[PDB]
């Protein structure tokens, strides 16, 4: 029931668990003298899905979604508490600030005006430094090009980020975010993890049977494009090109290049523009520009 309540109502199940964690942190420590957060991992079942299939259903429920990030905004500090000083008497005052991104449930909106005046009416100053600052980030993530049905458009979503995890995001890397699909539509990302044909046991027997014959390479190079006459050694190099290298990483030094690069020139009469469609439609993942 606790598992089902976490999976269907995290707004009513996540704050008592973090209250228990803060009480356990206070009970486990006996020295004198801040909140504590939580994080999850593991299989989700039907909650783990592609962002293009992410729709208006299961709003309140927590969503695990993987993909590729496109943008990472500038780190921006925000005020959650502002302090001030009264020089007429030398006192100190403070005010707190709340919004819809600090709690999972929506609180009653309190638009607290910044104090430009005292309640008595005296002058005051901005005590910059005793007032805490919490930085936030706004990143965008869309689906991976290998799992998505390539030919369509990618759908991206926005993640609002807290102070804690602001140094673990960069564009160009495969990522898997875990958050809550709140709609004031965005996800409140609490857990980020930075990180295709199925193989049977019958296909492995066929590739193990074709591993020791010394006539395999020529017929595999000839079998990629039957609509193009000739050019056997060029597609031999194209076969060696699309399979790859080794990507050797040296110890305490720079990495070594495993990728190969091919440039093709000649008269514009042949199938150089017809070979790119074949290498785009037959590779594992390919991008043509």
């Amino acid at each position: 029931s606790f598992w089902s309540g976490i999976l269907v109502e995290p707004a009513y199940f996540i704050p008592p668990a973090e209250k228990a964690l803060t009480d356990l942190a206070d009970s486990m420590d006996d020295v004198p003298h801040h909140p504590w957060k939580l994080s999850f991992k593991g299989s989700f079942g039907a909650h783990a899905l592609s962002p293009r299939t992410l729709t208006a259903q299961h709003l309140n429920k927590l969503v695990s979604v993987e993909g590729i990030v496109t943008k990472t905004s500038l780190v921006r500090p925000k005020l959650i508490r502002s302090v001030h000083y009264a020089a007429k008497t030398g006192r100190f005052h403070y005010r707190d600030y709340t919004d819809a991104t600090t709690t999972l449930t929506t609180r009653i909106p309190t638009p607290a005006i910044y104090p430009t005046e005292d309640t008595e009416g005296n002058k005051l100053t901005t005590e910059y430094g005793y007032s805490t600052f919490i930085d936030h980030q706004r990143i965008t993530v869309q689906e991976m090009p290998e799992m998505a049905p390539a030919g369509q458009l990618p759908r991206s979503i926005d993640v609002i980020l807290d102070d804690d995890l602001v140094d673990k995001t960069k564009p160009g890397d495969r990522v898997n975010v875990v958050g809550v699909f709140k709609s004031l539509t965005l996800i409140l990302g609490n857990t980020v993890y930075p990180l295709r044909q199925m193989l049977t046991d019958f296909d492995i027997r066929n590739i193990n049977k074709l591993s020791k014959k010394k006539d395999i390479f020529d017929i595999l190079s000839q079998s990629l494009a039957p609509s193009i006459y000739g050019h056997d050694h060029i597609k031999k190099a194209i076969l060696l090109m699309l399979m790859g290298g080794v990507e050797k990483n040296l110890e305490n030094g720079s990495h070594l290049r495993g990728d190969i690069n091919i440039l093709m020139v000649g008269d514009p009469s042949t199938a150089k523009s017809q070979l790119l469609r074949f290498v785009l439609n037959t590779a594992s993942l390919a991008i043509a520009t």
Binding site: Q197, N206, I207, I216, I219, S223, H233, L240, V246, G258
Partner: protein, 87 residues
Amino acid sequence: VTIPFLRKYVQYAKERVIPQLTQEAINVIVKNYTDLRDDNTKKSPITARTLETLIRLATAHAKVRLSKTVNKVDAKVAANLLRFALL
């Protein structure tokens, strides 16, 4: 041979087998690089980066056959690809 077979072939070679060098394929590629470093006087410049690309392809062929280490014929087919693409 067909379209859904070579994709599985390429990804199984990419995920399982990593090839390593042998003494039988170092000397023939050393001989080929020192013989071409001919082309500089006749038709094309040969650089140091090309040394790296001359064994990358060998490894390639050695992983096309998915053997655990390289062979002399991989360097021979890389030299044959070089003779076709250079001359």
